[PDB]
């Protein structure tokens, strides 16, 4: 078994952590336990602090916008913590953070070619330093900065099969035009193809020219007066004409991936430890009647079906895109 450690630039501080990814079960969130190793001659007249913060970034330079929480701990022991105490020695001081079950998940917005610095999004950072007191300034040389993450995984029990149907009645047409669609399942993994089963029965006197199917991502940012952004991730267009007084039925397959959407600004990707390549953002699982906390971006996916009648008929099929639990 291994542990993660990071050292201070001056070589008088070290932070030990069990893991970097802390799963977010809906009932409770995995605690952030650890321990700090400090030089014997460094605490002569000082005290050692540990700070964990969660921030939402939407600015490039502080015009820059950031709003954050600071959780402050100044140093029952768990099994890992007592093992670390046994291994390191007496001069290791343990800390534990129990972050709330409701809190933004690690999501980083995709940076454009012009953006520099830290990528916009939500991230967690564990910081530990030794200072004479609070008011003393702490340089980047005398503190340890480490980045952790909060993640969720696919639910054990899949939900009901998505389905959505609609009817549009045209002006000069007595009978209406009927559309139906249905996904294969609800919970889809990353890279797994989505098979939309489109079945349209036209009884009107107007034909249908093209059928457009697209998978869209709804990044809901609650800080900007609940502004909602939707960007397509996969598009499949076919010239499937259905003549009047006739029935059509076909099955279309799509698969959202990142190799095609690199040029899109403001995409939602899973959290990054640093400048790195990460997949598309997984859907956020929310508790029943969950309050809209200000920090965080809520992402959900929906499949759209559209007929371009020679005036358009469309439906939306929500689904869930998450990683399987390991």
């Amino acid at each position: 078994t291994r542990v993660f450690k990071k050292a201070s630039p001056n070589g008088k501080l070290t932070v030990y952590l069990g893991k970097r990814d802390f799963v977010d079960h809906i009932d409770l969130v995995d605690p952030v336990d650890g321990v700090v190793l400090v030089d014997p001659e460094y605490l002569k007249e000082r005290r050692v602090y540990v700070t964990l913060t969660v921030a939402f970034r939407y600015g490039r330079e502080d015009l820059g916008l950031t709003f954050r929480k600071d959780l402050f701990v100044a140093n029952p022991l768990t099994r890992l913590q007592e093992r670390l105490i046994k291994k390191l020695g007496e001069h290791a001081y343990p800390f534990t953070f129990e972050i709330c079950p409701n809190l933004p998940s690690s999501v980083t917005l995709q940076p454009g070619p012009e953006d520099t610095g830290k990528a916009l999004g939500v991230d967690y950072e564990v910081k530990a330093f030794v200072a004479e007191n609070l008011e003393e300034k702490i340089h980047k040389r005398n503190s340890v900065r480490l980045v952790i993450r909060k993640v969720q995984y696919a639910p054990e029990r899949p939900g009901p099969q998505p389905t959505a149907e609609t009817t549009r009645q045209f002006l000069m047409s007595d009978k209406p035009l009927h559309l139906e669609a249905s996904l294969d399942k609800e919970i889809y993994y990353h890279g797994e193809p989505i098979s939309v089963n489109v079945h349209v029965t036209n009884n009107t006197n107007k034909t249908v020219k093209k059928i457009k199917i697209s998978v869209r991502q709804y990044a809901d940012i609650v800080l900007f007066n609940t502004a909602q952004y939707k960007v397509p991730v996969a598009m499949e267009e076919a010239d499937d004409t259905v003549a009047p007084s006739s029935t059509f039925s076909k099955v279309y397959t799509l698969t959202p991936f990142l190799a095609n959407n690199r040029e899109k600004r403001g995409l939602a990707l899973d959290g990054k430890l640093k400048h790195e390549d990460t997949n598309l953002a997984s859907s956020t699982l929310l508790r029943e009647g969950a309050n809209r906390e200000i920090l965080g971006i809520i992402v959900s996916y929906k499949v759209k079906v559209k007929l371009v009648v020679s005036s358009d008929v469309a439906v939306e099929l929500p689904f869930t895109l998450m990683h399987p639990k390991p």
Partner: antibody
């Protein structure tokens, strides 16, 4: 569920050849397709791989300027063009795959395609 | 990264214990896998992480890590385990295999 491949054969000392690895069961975007070669009487060596989810391609220093790996997601097949082979390229080529997300160890292997230069 | 594998050949009866060591040149973390290749067939995965057994492999195969010294151990050699074993690291993009260890009878 399984991988198949074809294309191996006798090549002129400086000719060209192409091997295609047809994948059944796995989805191309959900996995990463690798190519591993085994010289007659020696160990295994990695030559090329693809990461079609991100669009990346990686090679080895011995074949950097000659081999070209590409995939066709419509037919769920990956190819390996060998533009200019030399006499030490004679080996047996195994088409391998791995989990695209959080794994890089080859778990499904195809049969061998002998290539004699 | 060089991945030197020792021994290059063993000789163990049926029902004995064998151990194959594979030492990385530099730190490779716990990203090491093991394969088994009977002559004429394709390699089969045995242990994907440092010591995590792959589905379908019997319970006798096991792995371990101590620094940069990964070891694969077979607790009992039934006569169907005489083949060649390779150690692979997959942390860095020039993925390198082990030299190759053969088991005789």
């Amino acid at each position: 569920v399984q991988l198949v491949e074809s294309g191996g054969g006798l090549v002129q000392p400086g000719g060209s050849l192409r091997l295609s690895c047809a994948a059944s069961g796995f989805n191309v975007y959900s996995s990463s397709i690798h190519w591993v070669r085994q010289a007659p009487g020696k160990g295994l060596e990695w030559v090329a791989s693809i990461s079609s989810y991100y669009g990346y391609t990686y090679y080895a220093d011995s074949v950097k300027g000659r081999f070209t790996i590409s995939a066709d997601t419509s037919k769920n097949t990956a190819y390996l063009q060998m533009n200019s082979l030399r006499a030490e390229d004679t080996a047996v080529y195994y088409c391998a795959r791995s989990r695209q997300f959080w794994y890089s160890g080859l778990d499904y292997w195809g049969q061998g395609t002998l290539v004699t230069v | 990264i060089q991945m030197t594998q020792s021994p290059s050949s063993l000789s163990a009866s049926v029902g004995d214990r064998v151990t194959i060591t594979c030492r990385a040149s530099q730190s490779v973390s716990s990203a090491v896998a093991w394969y088994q290749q009977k002559p004429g067939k394709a390699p089969k995965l045995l242990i994907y992480s440092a010591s995590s057994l792959y589905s379908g492999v019997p319970s006798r195969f096991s792995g371990s890590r101590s620094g940069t010294d990964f070891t694969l151990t077979i607790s009992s050699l039934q006569p169907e385990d005489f083949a060649t074993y390779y150690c692979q690291q997959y942390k860095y993009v020039p993925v390198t295999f082990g030299q190759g260890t053969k088991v005789e009878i």
